[PDB]
Amino acid sequence: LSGTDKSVILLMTIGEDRAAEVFKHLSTREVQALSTAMANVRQISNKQLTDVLSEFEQEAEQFAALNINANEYLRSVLVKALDILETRDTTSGIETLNFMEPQSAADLIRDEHPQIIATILVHLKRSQAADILALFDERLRHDVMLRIATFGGVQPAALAELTEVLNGLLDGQNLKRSKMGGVRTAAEIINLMKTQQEEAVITAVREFDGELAQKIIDEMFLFENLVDVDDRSIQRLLQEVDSESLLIALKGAEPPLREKFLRNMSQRAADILRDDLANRGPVRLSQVENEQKAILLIVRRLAETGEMVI
Amino acid sequence: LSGTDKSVILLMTIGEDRAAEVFKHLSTREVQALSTAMANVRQISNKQLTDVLSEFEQEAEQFAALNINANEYLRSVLVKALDILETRDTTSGIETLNFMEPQSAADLIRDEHPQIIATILVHLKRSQAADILALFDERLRHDVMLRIATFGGVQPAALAELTEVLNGLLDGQNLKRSKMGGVRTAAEIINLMKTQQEEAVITAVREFDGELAQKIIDEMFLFENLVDVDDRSIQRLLQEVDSESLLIALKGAEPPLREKFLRNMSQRAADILRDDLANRGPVRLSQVENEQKAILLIVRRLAETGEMVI
């Protein structure tokens, strides 16, 4: 069980009033995440209750409770004697503007004023700002660089307003949470089609836009590209591929790819595979395509685990 | 835990009224620092409470409490019988005008009246005032020197007013606390880019301003400058660099840098590295750039610890 699940069980088992009181001490993101997780709860078993309660007790003893509300206590002490969460939120927004993809952030801030872009990048990590600037056009990127070189500081109010606007934009994006609609999704769809319709769609997209089809082609693994994969990954792949499946799949493979597979096998196994290829009769194209699809699925599984580099 | 953290825990665990009473006996800087630290408190564990309480007891016994409020007691005694914190604040401001960077202080006091500049520098340390004067133009620097040579003393009221104005300027600067926007920040950003965009940005900045690009270049470590680093630092670097990583990185390195690395290795290891360089095939530029980036990260880590001089 994740910590979110344990927290959800704890909130469900303490009563509605207590859970509501706890929500008053949690941030908006945490409350939203817990409410979303509480929505999908269908059953809580005996272990999921007892272990969660014991872990909650051990955690309450871990930091020994205490920690009176910092904001109210600090305000009362300052008032009686005589930043804070706003500074923490600005720091979090600085963190939020570094974990995103460089392309997404660049597109988000592409239309902003060059001084605004420079101000944002100053507070960002060096690598993230470097990647974002690499995606801008020459003129805008160099203008932002020059403005950074002469950055004179920003008043806290303007920085806070910019942070609030960026937080609103991020909230809108997260509410959208745009489902993958780029060339990668189409390539995944295209890879699972039959060869006929796959090639027809690729050719038609190239007819409409050669660049778009090439982008989809670059994002798809339609077999016959294992020749460009390193020898170590191919050797790792051969340990998970059945000999008969490899034999059937390599029947329709090009001689370069066939030699690429043979070079990564043991010499005895390579000779056996060559003899089987020379002796086995014609194989229906559908079976070869199915075997190649299975090999591609194995390749994807290995790549997801980090054992294979594509 | 730092002393600030222990003080914050102590203030949180004594109650709001007691903490407010304690704040009345603390300076503005201390109160602001504690309030900022109290803002980020999320939990205080059992050890963080018990050890802090025990240390507070041992500290209260260390100076044996006592020390009645000096200002009120002194005022009452003087009134009944018949400088102080103002003098202490002026001394602190004198200290504050010596821990700053010479460039920052020089820019702060560049536009001031030459007599004011001379008066400020008289109360400063010899080295700090020497460094500040080195950054002024010939005419202004020599005028300030001549005014120092004929410095006749300043009334306490004028010195106090100047100290108050300087304290206000310092408070404004600390509220700003200008995030690093000079050529160093851009150089750090530029060093983490890919070679293409890094070189393009450098060339474009030189097109706009050759001096600015040179300043950014002088503040960046884009590899290939390890030839200018001393032999001892290179030898220290080789102890932390993997042999294969060094071999890949040196594949795209210039012959001068390659000989610089080879001269700092043992003769057997140097021969092995030469043979590997001569025998290993072509390496993709991206891998070489990644290895050089890793070596630069190791160099930065060593420099931060003082084991390497750049």
């Binding site: 910590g3 979110t4 009563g15 207590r18 001490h25 007790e57 930091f63 | -």
Partner: peptide, 27 residues
């Protein structure tokens, strides 16, 4: 369901919030 449920119900809501925050951070 021993007395531990009742004991946990009497804990400060801030303590529960901090435990929840730590659990979510550990994810």
């Amino acid at each position: 369901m021993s007395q531990r449920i009742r004991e946990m119900s009497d804990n400060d809501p801030r303590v529960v919030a901090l435990v929840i925050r730590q659990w979510m951070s550990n994810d």
